[model samples]
Target: MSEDSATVAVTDDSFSTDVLGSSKPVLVDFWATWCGPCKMVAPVLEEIAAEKGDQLTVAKIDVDANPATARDFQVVSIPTMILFKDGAPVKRIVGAKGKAALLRELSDAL
Candidate 1:
């Protein structure tokens, strides 16, 4: 993954402060180490984050480690991807999605 698209590992303490309060759009990947699908989509997400770093902030949150955030987002599955702008969610994908699909979703946000 490009340095610009580097996925920041978020903690419970930083969830609200970093994601919700970010000045730029935030792409939060709700995932766990054990999730197969989550692993699959991670690289695509990193590419998107790298390309869109100026306009977006991509991050990863371990659902198992941060249940509070997972519950708040109603992230029932392993790879829930949420895009937020101005501290509000504007787009989402609930499965292992490809880079092309993610870019299409991001277009809507832009």
Candidate 2:
């Protein structure tokens, strides 16, 4: 579970209602438990979730546990962050990034 109140753990079953249907922009992190880069990005995502709660929604999907969503998104790598708006993916950032870089990648969505 995320320490940040704004971050939500999403699964394949809840993805549609939680992310695609969200009114605000949603940051969907596709990660795995054993991926080192995924671990590094978790806290940064939590901070983004906390700071951008009013403007965005942050959710995490464990790729290992939920293969359907990962396959649908064609996420070949861990730490794949997708920003979705109106049920469509608007931006994608691959691999682990610093807070500044992540913010820059999300600038349009933000």
Candidate 3:
């Protein structure tokens, strides 16, 4: 992690303020601590959070801990990524993706 990592942990209580109400684009990662692919995708998100912190916000949501947000998003799978712009989900990415691939997919929204 960087000295000040930009990835944030979001929950049902803070989701609105931390993600939906944010001025910049927010990438919400619906994942869990016990998931394998979530581990694979964690560093990719961390790198992006480190590089694009100014224009983007990377948020990690533990689906188990925050059931309300997960249910609202209808996240049935682990490692689901929803990019929110202007308080709405603009893009959805599932499974584990590499950093470059993830960035490429999110370029238009960013």
Quantify all predictions' global Cα lDDT against the true fold. Answer: 0.72, 0.72, 0.71
TM-score of 1: 0.75
- TM-score result, candidate 3: 0.73
Candidate 2 per-residue C-alpha lDDT over 2-35 given as tens digits, one digit per residue, 9 for 90 to 100 = 4546666787778888776776677777776666
TM-scores, each model vs. reference = 0.75, 0.74, 0.73
The true-versus-predicted C-alpha distance at residue 106 of model 1, in Å, is 1.6
Model 1 poorest 10 in a row by lDDT: 1-10
Query: How many residue pairs clash in model 3?
Result: 0
The alpha-carbon lDDT assigned to residue 97 of candidate 1 equals 74
Residue pairs that clash (backbone atoms under 3 angstroms), model 1 = 5-50
The 10-residue segment of model 2 with minimum total lDDT is: 33-42
Model 1, span 1-110: residue lDDT tens: 42663557678677889877777777776676566665567678778777666777777777677677557866555666788888887898766777887777668887
lDDT by residue for model 3 (19-63), tens: 767777787767756666756676887776666666777777776
Sort the predicted structures by lDDT, highest score first: 1, 2, 3
Lowest lDDT 10-residue stretch of candidate 3: 1-10
